[PDB]
Design a protein around this ligand. Structure first.
Ligand SMILES: [Mg+2]
Lengths: 144, 133, 231, 82, 96
RNA sequence: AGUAGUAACAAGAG
RNA sequence: UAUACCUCUGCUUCUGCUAUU
RNA sequence: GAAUGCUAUAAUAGC
């Protein structure tokens, strides 16, 4: 239902095929404005930006002030931060598993693909390995 | 001991304008930031695994020794002792609807102190600060 | 360069155990080899003082079955291990823990030792490090121009004092032989930028994940960065 | 007691994987009591950490007089194997 | 909210009318687009260093190429025979 | 049967 | 096949995010 | 005549 509805409100948008996944991608943004009061996903970038510019004018420096703190936090943030999020989707077994385990299974698997950024302990170098893992031609993982 | 050595006045029926303010829920032995507080507890319970000696170490040398001497001959698990100290060093400070009573030893009894339409006079026990006075 | 030099002179123990000390401070071994060599020499000098120095069951120093040394090498061991060792020793013998991390500790003297290697004068560098410690650790300073400045109570024997000054000049000569001595002399400073570079895959996904009326992400970035959407 | 529905399915295996990590951690906590209270920090090996701590513990236990020569020999011999 | 209401209440022009729209938004998730969230991070991190502008950009980028797993599937039954079977999501178009 | 209600249980497994 | 009138199981038959902390 | 910012396995709220 969600999958149908999401696309039902974007159907008048730009439809294309992803040359990465091979998936059927739909893009409503900068699309034709609505003719009726049926839910519309056709948001106009210019209007989103103008709205944020006013917000930035009304709240001067807030964006960079936040960005600074958010960035300085990330530098201090360790990997174990990811082990406090209930049931998380584990890609090794394709079933939900505890956040703490789902991570462990990813760290163990990453090591096999020569990705030890985790070991450094900071979140950034572990995140670097995640966007690098997409470039690997094949991904190996343990399965008992 | 505070509830026990307390004295109860009269209940009064009438309008109370409760105001939502960030108050301390529990009286502390000595207030420190969680970071400073954590380093103190380490010196009390786990000396070897303390890390870099900080200024704080010296500042609470009386409290460290006092607590170390008081918890010395016990058989309770260090992890419990650790949280029991954290409870009376780290501040539990949260928003609450209050009316003319902010002192922690009053806030702990806040449920019995008033509602929107009534008020209860209550004198706690032990001691009260000259600063709060 | 220094990369090929350190491989010849120092063993893989001293190489790695320095690179870990450099890693803990979050600084690249390759992008600052001057800082690597400093810690390498600092570590190698410390191990030579403790190498054959052993204690018997009575409690007297002797030269080498037996697994209990006279000194404790703190330099090299990871911060949290080093500090555990430094705190363990202090609390056991019953002395106050120095606020700065020590290099060595003599089990017979029952005092902490601070080691230092200087380019200029060994006598000057003694009074420089006397401001922070004062009398927390018994300093033991050396330099490459055959110059030693130990504390009034120096446990280092005459036969031991040579081995240090031999290896100090032997390496200093080996740097001047390969013409890499000049690399360590010149001032080296660089702020370690927190670089997070995107791969090829994720970069493609970002380019297809753009609003309509955009070629690639670069386009969307410059638009948001530059143009004004008022009205 | 833990829901034992798991004992019927092939997921059984994970109990051993758990009861392994459990062993490694529980022992680490016996070496470092502060681990229970505050998160331990280090990019070095758990074995490296545990080894050095026990090595000191043994030495200071001997030199203080908590441990005997016969025991210390065993201690340094066993730690030698690592 | 008590403070906010009080100020916006008293700020009402004399003679004018203050009106409160008790509001809810429909299909909040189905309509809100990742690429718009991408724009937001770019516009918000404008002064931040290039690595952190990119770091933020990833999360919306993943969500603009995300894939929804369809869960367990559908169960088919014969009342006469008293049989039931789970059709897994991969085998959804296996039956007419 | 029934519970229940946009899909299940009315035991499952070796 | 059989052991099986036996044995094991009762959230693990996919339970998320953000806040009150 | 003010502060001190956090960070559960419950429950509530919205998605
Ligand atoms: Mg809604």
């Amino acid at each position: 239902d969600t999958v149908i509805r999401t696309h039902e409100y974007s159907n008048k948008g730009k439809q294309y095929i992803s040359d990465v996944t091979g998936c059927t991608m739909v893009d409503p943004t900068n699309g034709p404005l609505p003719e009726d009061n049926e839910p519309s996903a056709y948001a106009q970038l210019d209007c989103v930006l103008e709205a944020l510019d006013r917000m930035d004018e009304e709240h001067p420096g807030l964006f960079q002030a936040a960005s600074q703190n958010a960035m300085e936090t990330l530098m201090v943030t360790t990997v174990d931060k990811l082990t406090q999020g209930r049931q998380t989707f584990d890609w090794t077994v394709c079933r939900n598993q505890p956040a703490a385990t789902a991570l462990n299974t990813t760290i163990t698997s990453f090591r096999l693909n020569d990705l030890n950024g985790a070991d450094k302990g900071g979140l950034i170098p572990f995140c670097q390995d995640i966007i690098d893992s997409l470039d690997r031609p094949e991904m190996t993982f343990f399965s008992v | 001991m505070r509830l026990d050595n307390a004295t109860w006045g009269r209940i009064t029926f009438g309008p109370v304008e409760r105001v939502r303010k960030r108050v301390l829920l529990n009286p502390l032995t000595k207030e420190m930031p969680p970071d400073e507080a954590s380093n103190v507890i380490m010196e009390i319970l786990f000396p070897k695994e303390a890390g870099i000696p900080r200024e704080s170490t010296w500042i609470h040398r009386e409290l460290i020794k006092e607590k170390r001497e008081k918890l010395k001959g016990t058989m309770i698990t260090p992890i419990v002792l650790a949280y029991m100290l954290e409870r009376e060093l780290v501040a539990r400070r949260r928003f609450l609807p209050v009316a003319g009573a902010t002192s922690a030893e009053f806030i702990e009894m806040l449920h019995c102190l008033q509602g929107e339409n009534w008020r209860q006079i209550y004198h706690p026990g032990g001691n009260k600060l000259t600063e709060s006075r | 360069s220094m990369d090929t030099f350190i491989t010849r002179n120092f063993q893989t123990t001293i190489i790695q155990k320095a690179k870990n000390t450099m890693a803990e401070f979050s600084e690249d071994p390759e992008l600052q080899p001057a800082m690597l060599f400093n810690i390498c020499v600092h570590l190698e000098v410390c191990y030579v003082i403790s190498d054959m120095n052993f204690l018997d069951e009575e409690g007297k120093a002797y030269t080498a079955q037996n697994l209990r040394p006279q000194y404790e090498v703190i330099e090299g061991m990871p911060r949290t291990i080093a500090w555990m060792v430094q705190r363990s020793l202090a609390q056991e013998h019953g002395i106050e823990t120095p606020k700065y991390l020590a290099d060595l500790f003599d089990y017979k003297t029952k005092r902490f030792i601070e080691v230092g290697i200087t380019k200029g004068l060994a006598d000057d560098y003694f009074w420089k490090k006397k401001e922070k410690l004062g009398n927390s650790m018994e300093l033991m300073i050396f330099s490459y121009n055959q110059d030693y400045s130990l504390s009034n109570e120096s446990s280092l024997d005459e036969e031991g004092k040579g081995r240090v000054l031999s290896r100090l000049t032997e390496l200093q000569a080996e740097l001047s032989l390969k013409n890499l001595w000049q690399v360590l002399i010149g001032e080296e400073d660089v702020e370690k930028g927190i670089d997070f570079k995107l791969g090829q895959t994720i970069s493609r996904l970002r380019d297809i994940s753009v609003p309509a009326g955009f070629s690639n992400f670069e386009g969307m970035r410059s638009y948001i960065d530059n143009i004004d959407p008022k009205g | 007691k833990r829901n034992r529905s798991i004992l019927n399915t092939d997921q059984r295996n994970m109990i051993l994987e758990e009861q392994c990590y459990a062993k490694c951690c529980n022992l680490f906590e016996a070496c470092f009591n502060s681990a229970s209270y505050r998160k331990p920090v280090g990019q070095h090996s758990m074995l490296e950490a545990m080894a050095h701590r026990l090595r000191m513990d043994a030495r200071l236990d001997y030199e203080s007089g908590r441990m005997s020569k016969d025991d210390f020999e065993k201690a340094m011999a066993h730690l030698g194997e690592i | 909210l008590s403070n906010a209401v009080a100020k916006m209440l008293s700020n009402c022009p004399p003679g004018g009318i203050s009106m409160t729209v008790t509001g809810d938004n429909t299909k909040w998730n189905e309509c809100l687009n990742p690429r718009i969230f991408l724009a937001m991070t770019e516009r918000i991190t404008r002064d931040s260093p290039i690595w952190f502008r990119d770091f933020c950009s990833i999360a919306p980028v993943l969500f603009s190429n995300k894939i929804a797993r369809l869960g367990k599937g559908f169960m088919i039954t014969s009342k006469t025979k008293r049989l039931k079977a789970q059709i897994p999501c991969p085998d959804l178009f296996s039956i007419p």
